[PDB]
Amino acid sequence: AALFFLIPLVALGFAAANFAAVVRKPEGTERMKEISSYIRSGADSFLAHETKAIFKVAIVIAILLMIFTTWQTGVAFLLGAVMSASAGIVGMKMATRANVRVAEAARTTKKIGPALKVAYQGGSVMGLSVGGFALLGLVLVYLIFGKWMGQVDNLNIYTNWLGINFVPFAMTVSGYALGCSIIAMFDRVGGGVYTKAADMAADLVGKTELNLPEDDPRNPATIADNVGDNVGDVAGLGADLLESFVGAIVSSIILASYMFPIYVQKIGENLVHQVPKETIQALISYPIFFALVGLGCSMLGILYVIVKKPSDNPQRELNISLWTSALLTVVLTAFLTYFYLKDLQGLDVLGFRFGAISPWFSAIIGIFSGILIGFWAEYYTSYRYKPTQFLGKSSIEGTGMVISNGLSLGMKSVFPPTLTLVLGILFADYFAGLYGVAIAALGMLSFVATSVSVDSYGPIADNAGGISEMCELDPEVRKITDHLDAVGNTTAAIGKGFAIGSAIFAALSLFASYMFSQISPSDIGKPPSLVLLLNMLDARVIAGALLGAAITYYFSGYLISAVTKAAMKMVDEIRRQAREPDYNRCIEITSDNALKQMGYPAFIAILTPLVTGFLLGAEFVGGVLIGTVLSGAMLAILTANSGGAWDNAKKYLEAGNLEGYGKGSEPHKALVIGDTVGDPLKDTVGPSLDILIKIMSVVSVIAVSIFKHVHLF
Amino acid sequence: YVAALFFLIPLVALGFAAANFAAVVRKPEGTERMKEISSYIRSGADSFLAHETKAIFKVAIVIAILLMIFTTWQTGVAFLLGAVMSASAGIVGMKMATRANVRVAEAARTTKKIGPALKVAYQGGSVMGLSVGGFALLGLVLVYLIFGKWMGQVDNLNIYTNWLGINFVPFAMTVSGYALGCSIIAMFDRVGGGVYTKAADMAADLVGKTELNLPEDDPRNPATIADNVGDNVGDVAGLGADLLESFVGAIVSSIILASYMFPIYVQKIGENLVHQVPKETIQALISYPIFFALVGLGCSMLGILYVIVKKPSDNPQRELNISLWTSALLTVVLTAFLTYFYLKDLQGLDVLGFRFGAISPWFSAIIGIFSGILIGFWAEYYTSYRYKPTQFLGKSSIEGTGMVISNGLSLGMKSVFPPTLTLVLGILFADYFAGLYGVAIAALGMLSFVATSVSVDSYGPIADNAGGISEMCELDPEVRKITDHLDAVGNTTAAIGKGFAIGSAIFAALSLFASYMFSQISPSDIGKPPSLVLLLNMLDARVIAGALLGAAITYYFSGYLISAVTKAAMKMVDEIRRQAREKPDYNRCIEITSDNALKQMGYPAFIAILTPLVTGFLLGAEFVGGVLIGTVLSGAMLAILTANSGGAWDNAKKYLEAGNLEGYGKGSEPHKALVIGDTVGDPLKDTVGPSLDILIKIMSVVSVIAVSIFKHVHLF
């Protein structure tokens, strides 16, 4: 058991070792070194600014979490914030360092294998830092606050000095989750505004009197964009997956903890717990062990792929990493489930239909759902398949036709993945109730380290190819690096789709956790069916649902406008710099403006439940959560798939798959308009929604202990 | 005595419509060129109507046969009756509009004044308004008398079990059948006719830009006449049928809730079933919505009469707003007395949710009314260039085309919050006053004066056709100025009316969701506490799954419609090229586009009608309740977004055309960007949004009906 608790440190040390191993490889030409120095300075500047703002917000949140609820809650909040920030910083430094070494491998060896290995060892640092830091924080919470302080021992509803009631350990893990959520909100909202403002400004300066090339170091927005790629597909997506991972695990824990007070019967004058402390604690700890086994299998798959004999098929290598981790987790967790829950009593009252093996059936379902959902994102965004081919071909009909067909593509694309989620939820429940729904969220993210490593591979290869083309490298070297960039292009779409699906699953598990956390000491005798209830006929619930949907749409629109404003401001600063390059100057101007913009979306996401709950109650807030989730899922999938389809249709034409037309032609102009429209949608709105749907649920789960009984109307 | 006096009101409205029809027909058509252009337009309209009506009849017969085999035969009879009422209103309104398009221009030319032309156009639109009101309430009065009182379905009010074992309260199921009847007409009009309209508009612009280069606004271009036909197909038949469906849906929901409260609030005192809400109150609440709607129609006729007889003026918007406010205020006042005197001596209103006694539902109704107008205003705030958002979009036109698209999407997304919040507060307060019954009464009050709303909505396209005929006939510049002023006023009223229709659709869809939940009552829940029966638990994984599925289906529905418009447009372009290769063929291309649009609507219509049957026989009534919530939420948001975005794009293009952007005018690059934005937005505002308005209601109606079957007959 202690070995499992050690696995997180193994992953952190693995990250350190891969960091050193890639750092040992050669940087090469001095031109490459200068470009990468620009990139690293921009990245570190952005990181410092955002971490300053993060610390400012986190101290206030921890003080409020200690004043209300308990002090362990605020401590766990800060712990989780630190773990996620650490994973992000480590991954970003590693990526900004490895972007050149990948190109040097490709050039020196004139081969694809060594460059791919360098890039994947680079991304595995972010993957392993995510996994290790997250599960390390969780093990620390489970040991220090969990067993040492006996919060897993009492498992009864505690009433704090203010009168707020809650199960202690549940509230503690909730605080930890909220910490991760703050880190992720900062990363996604802010960094996304920044990244897409930089990309839009890069496109813009090309058309001003400056006549600055897009792929030229003379253009400051080029370096800002190369920094933003890392800010996005390494820090942002990694933090998003980390939040979903921890959310699934915390939801399992909260449901388990609150089942203990739920299933008590007043047989005489005594309250008899129909689910005893043994089973409850076993179910509190089973998710942590499942996730630790997942991290172990992830490290094994990464090891196999980094030591594997070098090959010339990158896509195959990354997919091998994924499938190895998946199957290993499946088998090992099979034995874990069967042996860890075998001798427990009362599992039938918990929803386990086939006994101790029920949740494993749930977990694996998640896994498969995930991969399948991934596939759908690729089907509707790759020009290898029919939809993007049709979109690209329709370019000849005009620009309005490109826009309409892209919107149509996204809207229709939301259905296959939603149906995958629907069947996954139905079957997971069939096996093990809402607990099994949470275990499905976990299984889907059981190998988060490998998923995040493949996600971070993309931007590293993108920067490698960009450095190669900015340094005017040999055409064969450019071919190698561009092939790596295309593989990363496909993996990016798959990873974004997987992240959206994971966010939806974790948000639904958090909704269940919210309902369970509504338990008051006065409902102890009441039948369980009466307490765990959100009635949709209650007009406050319908009203709250409409409100949540509207707030989600408004959130998205505000982010679009913020991106455009920040881009125009960066263009103004670049003009000022030309009249009077400024790399960190423009990077920091845009970073500060994006951080200023983040105030209102963050306040929306965090304060909507507080305001509405203290105003109208916990049924209204349940409605708001359902509306937010239902609209966020759809809008996320839509924006992601539409932007991906537009981008890859432009590529389809640029690759000459549409005879007669190439760069500069009118169809290419139309597709470029479509791609500029979609960039903010896929890289800012979708991920921001992935976060919204979860963080609003977390804030709700926590504050419902207060406003459940403290509401104005 | 007085009851029959009110029951006569529908015939008064139908006769008022006939009289206005005749009065405008007496007006002069004028020049032979105007007569020829209008002959083209009217022939196209009649052709479209006939083609769509054939398919409507086929589907309606299949549905009515199924409604007789299952449930009861009165259900199928009421279904066919409602289909006929709505189809009649649509045909009448469209024929009248195609007739009045010339007489408005003749008023503008002969008299060189705005007042007389406005009067001609408003007398034209009041035909559709009054036909909607009269036909709808006539069908409902007939149902309440024949099946209701004569056959004693308002007398038994107990759960009846049909030969198959399907259980339901008879009158509730009957009114549900009638609602489904109206819904079929509305679905046909909206989905099909909307695909047709936007395919026609897209083909007109394309052929204007194709190798043929046939000028826009030219009789030589057949798609120009097809588009002038589509304006009426959309904002007269489509929008009128939509408002009619929302109206009838609110009323039917009130009735179903009332009917099912009788079995719900029973107490099993030993061996006796004691109805805590007695038959007297149940029947009073079944009939109160009908009388409220009749009073509303009377006030609407009065406002319309005042505005058509009022001293002519030079301010048209003021005249239409006067009609609206008069109808609203009169309905408010009279319905106050109606409520207090009709529900005073009842018993059990407390157990029902009436917080302030017999006057509670009136408080709900008026709220609806205000909600409506406020929602209307919001649609105007986010689409008119008199206000900041559309101004900013137009100004941003200078900064590229991608910026136009991004800012339009942003505008639309943000625009859902003010109107959605209006709906939120309306629901909260309406419920506060009189429970879910009061939510239904709020929907009704919001639509209490539907005749005037539909008349103002149908005014728009008639004036649009008048201005188009004026520009195609090369009329005098002053007459053209008058017609262009009328067209802009019609544009604003169109935006406001579309927004009001969306808000009404959301309110009616929520009332129908409540009706679904009430209709789930089984004979085995007689003793169960009401809290146990009226329950849709959101933790049940089935319900969450169904909600996700419904949202996803709504998005897919929208995307399919977008693609269908382009397919029909491309085919119409091919037909125009063939016509050039071989006075052009007007009805030919109109009928080709109509048949293609009707063939395409088959699949969205099948989605909307069968999704609840498939998913319900598969997984049950909790899953379908989830589906309904997802559909309602996603449809509300997408409807508001698409409508407001299309309106903002169009009115920003107009903002520039008037030179409100110093330095840029027709032909400049910002104008090209705004033209792209408008071509993108046309299908969204005129096809997707309304189709969703329909989806969110018709799926609920089908669910309310079939839940009697699949509630207990489901596979998993």
Author numbering:
A (entry chain B): 4 to 583, 594 to 726
B (entry chain A): 2 to 583, 593 to 726
Structure paper excerpt:
M-PPases are large (66–89 kDa), single-domain integral membrane proteins comprised of two identical monomers, each with 15–17 transmembrane helices. To date, H+-pumping (H+-PPase), Na+-pumping (Na+-PPase) and dual-pumping (Na+,H+-PPase) M-PPases have been found, most of which require potassium (K+) for maximal catalytic activity.
Following the inspection of enzyme key regions and structural alignments, it became clear that all of the data from 0 to 60 s could be combined into one, yielding a grouped structure of TmPPase in the resting state that is essentially identical to the individual 0-s (r.m.s.d./Cα: 0.33 Å) and TmPPase:CaMg (r.m.s.d./Cα: 0.29 Å) structure. The structure was solved at 2.54 Å along h, 2.95 Å along k and 3.38 Å along l with improved B-factors (108.65–70.28 Å2) and Rwork/Rfree values (21.95/23.61%) as compared to the 0-s structure (23.81/27.40%). The improvement in data quality parameters also translated into better electron density maps, so we could model most side chains and build additional key loop regions, for example, loop. Despite the presence of PPi in the crystallisation condition, it was not located at the active site, nor did it bind anywhere else. There were no observable significant changes in other regions of the protein, but the semi-conserved glutamate E6.53 appears to be flexible in all the structures as indicated by the absence of 2mFo-dFc density, even in the high-resolution 0–60 s structure, or negative density when modelled as seen in TmPPase:CaMg. Ion binding is the first event, as there is no evidence of PPi in any of the structures before 60 s post Na+-addition, nor in the grouped 0–60-s structure, and the ion gate E6.53 appears disordered: Na+ binding precedes substrate binding. This could thus explain why K+-dependent Na+-PPases can pump protons at Na+ concentrations <5 mM.
